[PDB]
Each structure stands twice: as C-alpha cells, then as structure tokens.
Symmetry: C8
C-alpha cells in the first residue's frame, strides 16, 4: 500500500524537482552526490515514520528485560522486514537519478579529460584554477560556450550513469532474489 | 483528513502565488523572509481554527479550577497533539519555498560577492548605495542587464536554498521520528 | 455548503473578470478601490439573500412585541452567526484581489515618486496636470512608453499589496480564532 | 432547476455569441442597446414558455367569473412568483454584457470627446458627418487607424460599463433582499 | 427526447458544415438562401420520419370512412402536435445560421452599395457585369483584394443578419407563447 | 444497434481516410467516382454480413419447395427490411462525401471552363492533351501554380457538390417517408 | 472478444509503427512487400496461440486412431472456424497498409516511368544503376531533390494502393458473404 | 495479471527511457548491445522476484531428499511454466527496441561502408582511428555534419533492425506455438 505510494511519490518528486547545478568546483561534488545520498536517507526515515508499526517497535525497545512479552526473534524479523519494505522508495530515487545522469554530470564534470571530445585549443595556456572553473560549467547549458564539447561530455557521463543505473538495478534485484529464496 | 487537505492546499497555494520580488534593497529582506515566515504562521493558525476541537480546548481553558471535569494531563496531550498535527502545512510551505529558492534569491541577493560569477568590471567605481541598488535587481529577470551573472547568481543561491531545503526536511523528519518513538 | 460554494465562486469570478483600469487620474481611485469594496458588499448581500434563513429572521423582525415566540437572545445569536458565515466570500475576494495587486496598482499609481525607479529625466519640465496624466498610465501595459519604469513600479505596488494581503489574512484568521475561542 | 439552467445558458449563449458591431453611426446605437434589451426580453418570454405552469395560469385567465375555482389571491401570487423566477436569466445577460462593455463601446462611441485620449490633431478640419464616421469605428479593431486612442477609448467605456454593471448588480440584489424580507 | 437530440444535432451539423460560398453572381442567391431553406425542410421531414408515431397517422389516413376507430378530432390534434414538436430543429438551424450571418453575406452581397464602406475609386469605370463579379467575391476572404471594404461589408450584413436572427427568435417565442396559452 | 454503429463508422472512416487524388486525367474520374460508389457497396455488403439474420435467409433460400416452413411473404418482407436497414451507412457515406466535395473536385475538374474563374491567358496556345493535364491538377494544392483559379474552381465544384448533397438527402428522406407511410 | 481486440491491436500497432523505407534498390522490394506479408503471418499465428482452443486441437491431433473420442467432422469444422476467426487481424493490417500506400510507395518506386510526372531532363544521360538509385529515394522525403516529382509519384502509387485496398476489401467481404451463406 | 502488467511496464519504461548513445567507438558496442541484453535480464529476474510462487520453489529446493512432499515432476513443470510466463516482458523489450532501431544504430554504426550512402570525399585521406571516430557519431543528430549521409545510414540500420525485429517475433511466436501444441 504505502510502499507503492512512496515508490510513485519518489519518482514524482524527482520529476517536479528542478535540478539547479551550481556549476562551481567547490560545490559541484557536494550538490551532485548529495542529491543522490540525502533524498534516499529522507525517504528511508519516511519509511520508518509513516509506517505506524514503528510504535510497537518503540514500546518493545524502551522497556527493559523481563517486561518483554514477545521474544526478540520476531523483533529482529520485523525490524528487518520493515527495512526491506522501506528500501523501495530510496531505490526508486537512485534508479531514476542515475537513469537521467544529471547528478553524475554535475558531480563528475571536473574529472573529465577535455581532449577526447572537441577542440584541443580550449584549455591551452590555462591554469588549473581557471581550468576547473571552465570544466565545472558543463552541466549549465546557458553558461558554456562550446556546444559540441558540451553535448559530447553530457552524452559520455549520461551513458556511464545509465550503465551504473542498470548495474545498480541488477545488484538490487539479485539481492532481493536471494532474500526471498533463503529467508522466508 | 484536513491535515492532508491543508498539506495539498499549501503546495497548491504556492503554485498559484505569483512571486513579485520588489528588487529594492530596503524591501528585499522583509519580503523574501516574510514570505517564508508569515504564510507558515497563517497556516498554523488555520490548523487551530479549522480544527473544531479547539472549542473543547476553549471551554476547558476558560473555566477556573474546580469546574474542570478532565484532568489537565489529557489537556496537555491534546494541545500538543493538535500542534504536531497542524505543523504539516507550515512545513510543506517551507519545504517547497526552499526547494524553489525564490525567497533566498530575493532576500540574500544583497549579500553576494560579485567577483565570483562574471565580469569584474561591473561594480568598479560604484558607491555602496548604487552597488546595493545594482545587486538587488538580480531576482528580477527583466531589470538586470548582465544575463550571465544573473544565471550564475541564481544557481548559487538556488542550490544553497535546496541544501537548506533538504537539511530542513531531514531535521523535521528526524524530530518526528523521535516523537513517535518515545511519546506514545 | 453554500459557504464553500460562494468562496469558490468569488475566486472564480475574479479569475474570469477582466480588469480594465481606466488609466485616467479622475477615475483611477474610484475604480481601483471600488473593485475592492463594491464586490465584497455584493457578496455580503448575496450571503443574506441566498441563505433562506433570512426569512425566519424577517418574520421575527416584522412582528411587534408580544407576538415574538422566540426570545431575542437566539435572534442576536443567529443574525451574528449568519454574518460570520457570509463573511467568507467577501474575505476571499479581498484576499485574491490584494494578492494580485491590480487594484493597488490602479488606485495608487498617482501617489508614486518616480525618482526611485528609472530615469530622472522623465518628469522634468512637466506640470502637475500632465505629470498626473503620465503617472496614471502605469497599469496600462500598452499605454506606457518606459517599460523599465513600468515593471519597477508594478513590482513595488504588487509587493506592498501582497504585504497588505497577508496582513489582512492574519488579522482575519486571528479574529476568527478569538471568535471560536470565547463565544461558543 | 430550469432557473439555474437558463442562468447558465444565458452566460453560455453570450460566450458563443460573436459580437459584430456595425461601426456605422446610424446603426451603432440600435445594435448596441438592442443587444442589451432584446435578448433579455427573449429570455423573459422563455421563462414563461419553458415553465409549464403558465398553462394553469392560462386556464384560470381565460374562463370568466363564476367558473374560477381558485381565488385570484393565489393567482396574483403565482404570476408574481413566476416573474421573479424568470428574472434571473435576463439579469445574468445584462450582468455579463455590462461586465464586458462591448455594447457600451458599440453604442456610446459616438458620444466621446476625443481630446481626452490621444492626439488633438485627429479631428481638426473635419465635418460632423465625417467626425461621426471616424468615431464610430472605435469598437472595430481592424478599421481604426490610431491604436493608442482606441485602447484609451475602449478602457474608458469599459470601466464605465463595469461601474454600471456593479451598480446594476447591487440594485438587483438589494431589491431581491427587500422582496424576501417583506413578502413571504 | 428526440426533440432535444435533433435540436442539438442541428446546431452540431451547422458547426461541422464548411460554408463554401461560390462567389459567383448566378449562384450566390440560390446557395445562400438555399442553405437557409433546404436544411430546415430536411430537418422537418426528419421530424416526421424519426418519430414512429407517423405510422399510426398513416394507418388512420389510408383507411376510408367507416373503418376509422378514432374520431378525426384527436387526429387533427396529434398531427398539429407533431408539427410543433418537429419545428424545433428547423428553428434552431435558422437561428444559428442568422446569428453567424454567412448566408446573408453570401446571398445579399450583390445588393450592396459600395460607396458607404471604403474607397469610392473601386467601381469607377466598370460595367454592371464586372461590378456584379466584383461585389460577389466579398464573402470569399482569399478572393477579395480590398480588405477594409471586406470587413466593413461583412460587419454590415452580419449585424443585419443578427437583427433578423433576434426578430425571428422573438416572433417564434411569442408564437409558441400564444400556442401554449389558448390551445391546451 | 449495429445500424447506428455502422452509420457512425462510415462517418468516422471517411474522417480518417486520406483523400489522395491522382491529378492525372486518365485516373481522376475512376478514382473520384469510385470512392463515391465502391465504399457504399462495401458498406452494403457489410450490412448483410454483420447482420447474422442473413443465415436464416440463407437456409430458407437453399432448400427447395416443399421443405419451406415459412411462406415466402415474410421472406420478401425480411429481405426488404434488411435492405432498408443496411441502406443507412451507404447513405451516410454519400452524404459526407458530397458535403465535402473532394470527389466532385477530383472527378469533374477536367470538365471545367477556365475562362470563368481567373486569367484568360492560362490555356492560350495549349493543346487539348496539355490542357487536360493542366486542369487535372486542380485538386492537388501543391501541384497547381495559380492559386486564385484553384480557390475559385474549388468553391464552384464544392457548392455544386453540396447542392447535390442536399438534393440527395431530400430525395432519400422523402423516399423513407413514403416507405414508412404506406408499407407497414 | 479477442477477435475485436486483435483487430483493434492491428490497426493500433500500424499507427505506432514508424515506417522507415531504406530507399535502396536492393532492399526496397523486400522491405515494402515484407511489411505487407510478414506482420499478417505473425497476426495469424497470434490468432492460433492466444486462442486456448488450439490445445484441444493439439490433443486430438497427437493421439492416433482409436483413441479419438470426437469424430474428425467437428475437428475439420473447428479448425476451419478458428482460421476464419483469426483471419480478421491479418485482414485489418493489409487493409490499413494498402489504404496508406506506404508499402506500395516503398516497393514499387523502382518500376515507375519518370516522364509522366515532372521534368524530362531528370534522368537524361544516366545509367540504369544510377537511375535505380535515383528512383528509389522517392519515399524518402528528405533524400529526394525534386519535390514536384515526389508528390506526383506519391499520389500515383497511393491512389493505386487505395484502389487495391478497396478491391481487397470487396473480395474479402464477398468471400465472407459466401461463407456465411452456404456453410452454416 | 502481473504478466500483462510487466509487458505494459516494459513498453512504457522504454518510452520514458532517454536513449543517450555515447558516440564513441570504445563504448558504442557495449552500450548499444547492453541495452538490448541487460534490461531483459532485469525483467527476467523481476519475473522471478515479483511472482511470490518462487518461495514455494525455494522451500522445495533447499530441503534435501526425503523431506520432499511433492515429487520433482511438478517441480520441473512449475519452474518451466514460471520461466515461460516471465519471458514476456523481456520479449516485449527486445521487440520494441528492435522496432525503433536505436540500439542497432548505436552499436553497428562503426561497421558501415560509407561509400553506399553519400559523398565519397568524406573519409578520403583519413586514418582508421579518425574514421572510427567519424562513423561513431552517426546516431548523434547534433554531432554529425553531413545530414544526408546521416539519414541514409539511419534508414539502413533501422530497416535491418526492423527486419530482425519481425524475424524475432516470428521465431518467438512459432516457438510458443510448438510449446502449446505438444507440452500441455
């Protein structure tokens, strides 16, 4: 119920989210990786909070030994089962974020090698500080002057991000395959 | 019921609201921060007023001691529970307002350092009064002459506002996590 | 029932209303303030007329003393309660009219000080009659020649109108908060 | 039932009606005032015809004295009540027609004073016949040469028509207020 | 039932009908008046044919005197009542056709006086045959060279057609008013 | 049931059909008249095939005399009644095809007289073979060079096709009027 | 049920199919005729596979003589009846494919005679290999240089394909007419 | 149920997927073939995971011999039946991916022979490394300079991919035809 609702909400919240990459070398990595990390953590704690069966977990965690009516075997089972139920909306966020490649373009555009894409006369005679300030404006469509380099560098990091998007989806599905094959 | 209605109404009222930043240095801060503060206060008092269970709170607050049929333990519990039920539509407003970054762009565009973004020849030979009147027109798209500086300064304060939007959402969710883990 | 219908009708009638500011100094104030005053009075008398419980008020007001089956205590209560039920659609009109700022732009564009916005060479060597005829055409987009002054003066009176729109909404909600806290 | 249907039909028939002002001085007044008068008369006789309770009025009007089973007190009451029920769709027509101001622009554009709006060199050296033929083409957007005079004269008669539209709505609502306060 | 269906079908069939005026003086009058006359005759015979109560009229008309089980008083009543029920979809066609004025523009554009609208130098030195071939192309937007004369002549015959459209609607409604006031 | 379905299907299949007139004099007549004749024949045999009451007609036609349980009076009645039920979707096709006039424009554009429409200098000094190849490209919008002649010739054959469309609808309705007045 | 579903699916799958004619003389015929032949064969085997009554056909075909509970008379009847039920979605595909004429344009544009359409100076002094490579690019809108020849050759093969589309529909309907007139 | 859901989800996930071919010769083949191979493997393991009848397969696979309540004949039958039920959403992906031809264009554009399409003067005097870097940018619309070669090479590999798309659909349907003809 709420698992399918939060999975649809995670894809819908990414669609309405307006990605504003700062295009500065100090704040590209923390913004690009931070939108890959911090909204999954919020969707994970939303999976604890919106599920009202954390309250029964709370009452059987707060009371000391002797008062525990249920054995902790079903407690370990339920806390595990509520984690792998609340691990869908984080995984849907990291799926669609890696499929679009906006965060890999924002975070990893200062690690590129510019000789592979377009003119070799771009960065000639330019210091590492100004070269980092030149490479960082690649995700900004209206701040980069060379359009052919910008489409070449966008397609390179978007295909790598889509490769990591499918390798993440295969590792997640194969993990849930092993979970529903040995544990219940 | 009305909590989900007011949460959807707060996001819908922001979408129909037309943000008109004054682009004057005397009235940028009060308008930009005021749209972050004053509509949450109105949505908080709307959470008291539209909930008709403030009337039973009113009758057990007006009558003096001796006439009180209920002990004030359930009174403290209910006034607390109606506050954390009416703290959703304010929090949805501050969420979407910080996600768009229009108020942080309107209020904090007189605190910028203009050397980081574009031409260094912009503010040379210009007094602090005219420099404040030059920096204040950054949120106004049709009043600013340098477009590359305007997109650079917009993206800088929009990513900082989105960082504060996610840090607010994490602090709010972790607070409600502790509330539903110790109190009921 | 009809309170929510008239509240939605007041917002919908403003959306279909085509604001035609006359852009003349004799008729700006009466048209701009008159659209803020006269449609709330019509929506207030519509709250009396469409509510068929004004007929029972009519019969117990027309008959003299002695024939009055009900005591006037419930009569004062019901006439008060029908006023604060019919004070929603007027308040929704003044809310959305102040949020858009078209009436404050139409009525108060002859009180502006033109040195704050754009060129100081606009009104130089111009008589008070022609200066009033120059300032009055600010709300008319297709009658004003200086576009930068027009957007600056529009944003100034629209933010002031939105400030008065939120101060009206706070004073109205805090008043209805006190009404539902002492009276019933 | 049919009162709300005819009220919605009167607003919908005005929206689909294509206003073709003749822009001739002989036929502006009769067309502009005639669309304000003649469609309310048709909607009034439609309120008699579509209401099948005119047939019982017909049978108790045709038979002479002695055969009248009902006293004429309920006959005066019912003929009055069917008039104030069939006076809604005429009033909705005159409301929306005065709110748009197309008929006041078509009928009263030969009464204007052209010095108030634009160039004083328009009508200089021009006979009353050609001046009437020049002023009459104001509602025709594609027949008038001076666009600034045309928008100024349109906004002047549209705000006056909207003033008469609200004064008509206030006089109609206050009349129906007195009707439902003394008569039943 | 089928009366409201045929009334909506007559307005819908006019909306999907593509008016192709021939713009020739031999065939303007027969096409323009013929679309005002011939589709009402087809909708009138459709009111006889689709109403299956013409079959009982057929059986009591074919059998001679002596075999007639019903007296012809109800036969005159029913044939009259089926005519005034099948006189709605013809009247809706002539209503919307006169409201748009395309047939009056097509049929009566050879009767115009061209001095009233635009340049007097249009028809100077031109024979009655070529003048009829010049006036006939007024309804054709892409065959007439003088656009100001074309909009002036269109608005003249469209307002006259809308005057005859409202005088037809008043004469039809007042006739049906007298029918439902004396006959049943 | 299926009569109204096939009538709506015939109008819908014409709307989705893309009329590609060949614009060659050998194949204009057979294509233009063939789309008026051959799809009505297919819709007529579809009226036999989709109606499953052709099977009972088949069994009482195949068996010789003596085995016929029903007299052939109801057989003549039913085969006639299934023809005039399956004569609606052919008639709807010929109605909408003559209302649009594309087939009369495609088939009869080699019979025109070109002096009536535009320049007399078009076909001067041109052989009957090249004149037939010049007149045949009138329905092709992107193959004809003279646009004023093309709109004049299109409007001439479209009004004649709409005249034959209404004369067909009157002859069909008057025929079905006589059928439902004498036969049942 | 599934017959009407597969018929609607065949028309819908053609509408979403993007026709990419190769415009090479070696692969025009096999692609153009192959899209007319191979998708009907797939829709025919889909009519066997999706119909689960092929399994009962499978069990009474695999078992040898003696074990056959049903006589093969109903087996011949059912295998025939399932073929003429699964011959609808192939026939709908060949219908809409011949109505659009894209396959006849792709497959038969190397058989054309180019003197009939446009300039005779196109193929003069050109070898059969380059003439086949010139004629093959007729279905490709963005690979053919002469647009008037391309629209003339498109309209010629599209009208011939629509002629074969209607002759196929007449031969198919007349065949199904004979089937439902002699066999059941 | 979930088979038709996953089949519609596979076609819908391809429609929302944004194909970003890297247009580099090292990473064209692995990206183009990898999007044909890796998403079918994920949809195949999704057919195991979302079907909860893998848990009963898990319990009867983990327990050793002696504890097996069911014989492994129904185990081989069910594991086979769940594979041919979960082989629909992979097959729908490879169907629509080969129908669009984007992966065959991305993976096989370094194997082309450029003399067949356009100018022979393109690759003259160019090394195999730069020729591979020139041919690889064919799927990139905004990175290839010769548009006529790009449309010719796109149509060549899209028709070959559509040929392999129909040969895959015929081999898959004929295989499922043999499965439902011998096995159950």
């Amino acid at each position: 119920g709420i698992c399918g609702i939060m999975a649809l909400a995670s894809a819908q919240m990414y669609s309405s989210f307006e990605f504003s990459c700062p295009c500065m070398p100090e704040y590209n990595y923390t913004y690009g990786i931070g939108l890959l990390i911090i909204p999954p953590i919020w969707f994970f704690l939303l999976g604890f909070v919106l599920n009202n069966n954390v309250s029964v977990l709370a009452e059987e965690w707060k009371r000391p030994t002797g008062r525990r009516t249920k054995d902790p075997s079903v407690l370990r089972y339920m806390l595990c089962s509520i984690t792998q139920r609340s691990l869908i909306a984080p995984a849907v966020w990291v799926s669609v974020t890696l499929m679009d490649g906006k965060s890999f373009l924002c975070a990893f555009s200062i690690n590129l090698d510019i000789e592979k894409f377009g003119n070799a006369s771009l960065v000639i005679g330019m210091t590492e500080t100004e070269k980092l300030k030149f490479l960082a404006r690649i995700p900004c469509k209206d701040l980069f002057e060379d359009n052919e380099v910008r489409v070449a560098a966008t397609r390179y990091i978007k295909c790598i991000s889509q490769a990591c998007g499918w390798m993440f989806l295969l590792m997640m599905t194969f993990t849930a395959f092993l979970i529903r094959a040995i544990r219940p």
